[PDB]
């Protein structure tokens, strides 16, 4: 299962 | 033995027209189980192992939503990095991200990872404590300050120590028939004459799983690395792996040489002779 939230650089 | 779950993501910018080429893959140990390719017609996360097909349409919706959001994050990143590095809008660049967790034989959390590269070089990586960052240069340092201010490490730590380990355990149980099965290497030795005074002995390991293996040569019971060649472990294409190690020997002295094979599927290491 993937990470629920992303973050931009 | 130890187990892992890892996701890999690559985006390659297309300056002439449109969005980047984005490819995402997920693994349990050395078994790919999911994929997403932006050039594919489905536009969905797709199964690549039978045991993940047990997951419902909800799983496929949630995983497709996350992976498409990931493609957008990489698209924005390629733009931000072009700015940080004062690069022109004309060249193609690459962003890569890998994250996941390792568990030991007890299936308890061992280590977590979350790292990024730009054009094949380290950019930013979560440290082993899952609390701080390693920023390679001043551009990555500005990202580190942004991520510290937004407490990104805390969110990643919760997934890596929790969710990641929990779902890894789920897949290991669900795909027990293959995921928990070790396939010992099938070994044999070949012999090749170069001249009337030199011969090559090649020790083969085939059809093994997982990919980790050690092949070593000994001469009269002592380690031999000189005049040896070891190829990189390679996929067979049926889910198993292959490797070989060769040694050059004086013709007629083949009997002094032994090949030694170490693998998780072998209770004791194997010895082979010509």
């Amino acid at each position: 299962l993937q990470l629920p939230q992303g973050t931009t650089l | 033995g130890s187990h892992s779950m890892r996701y890999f993501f690559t985006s390659v910018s297309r300056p002439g027209r449109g969005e980047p080429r984005f490819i995402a893959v997920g693994y349990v140990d050395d078994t790919q189980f999911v994929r997403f390719d932006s050039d594919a017609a489905s536009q969905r996360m797709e199964p690549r192992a039978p045991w993940i097909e047990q997951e419902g349409p909800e799983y496929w919706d949630g995983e497709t939503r996350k992976v498409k959001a990931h493609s957008q994050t990489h698209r924005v990143d390629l733009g931000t990095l072009r700015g940080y590095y004062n690069q022109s809008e004309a060249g193609s660049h690459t962003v890569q991200r890998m994250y996941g967790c390792d568990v030991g034989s007890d299936w308890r959390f061992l280590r977590g990872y979350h790292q990024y590269a730009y054009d094949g070089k380290d950019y930013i990586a979560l440290k082993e404590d899952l609390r701080s960052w390693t920023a390679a240069d001043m551009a990555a340092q500005t990202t580190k300050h942004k991520w510290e201010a937004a407490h990104v490490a805390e969110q990643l730590r919760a997934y890596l120590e929790g969710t990641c380990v929990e779902w890894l355990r789920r897949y290991l149980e669900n795909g027990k028939e293959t995921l928990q099965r070790t396939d010992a290497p099938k070994t044999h030795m070949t012999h090749h004459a170069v001249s009337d005074h030199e011969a090559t002995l090649r020790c083969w390991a085939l059809s093994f799983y997982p990919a980790e293996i050690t092949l070593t040569w000994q001469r009269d019971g002592e380690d031999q690395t000189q005049d040896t060649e070891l190829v990189e472990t390679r996929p067979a294409g049926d889910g198993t792996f292959q490797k070989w190690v060769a040694v050059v020997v004086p013709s007629g002295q083949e009997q002094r040489y032994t090949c030694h094979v170490q693998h998780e599927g072998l209770p004791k290491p194997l010895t082979l002779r010509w």
Partner: protein, 98 residues
């Protein structure tokens, strides 16, 4: 920019006239754009599939290209690779002993 390493090999130990799978494993390269062909007597084989792009801890990419094949005593098989790091395509001949 990292040049690809190439291995060409069969999935099972080769025997003339016996059905098998021909692989061309390309690894350790950067950037990801690469052209890989499997050749039968110097001619490009059409039905060739490949794995999904992935990469190693050092960020270098790897791919497996593959097709079904039946080796013989006289038919030659090879893998032909082009990449930005190469001035000419690199041809690696399949040798059942490797």
């Amino acid at each position: 920019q990292r040049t690809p390493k190439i291995q060409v090999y069969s999935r099972h130990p080769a025997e003339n006239g016996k059905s098998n799978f021909l692989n061309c494993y390309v690894s350790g390269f950067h950037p990801s754009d690469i052209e890989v062909d499997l050749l039968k007597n110097g001619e490009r084989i059409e039905k060739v599939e490949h794995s999904d792009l992935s990469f190693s801890k050092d960020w270098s990419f790897y791919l497996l290209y593959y097709t079904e094949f039946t080796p013989t005593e006289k038919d030659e098989y090879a893998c032909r690779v082009n990449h930005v790091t190469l001035s000419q395509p690199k041809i690696v001949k399949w040798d059942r002993d490797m």
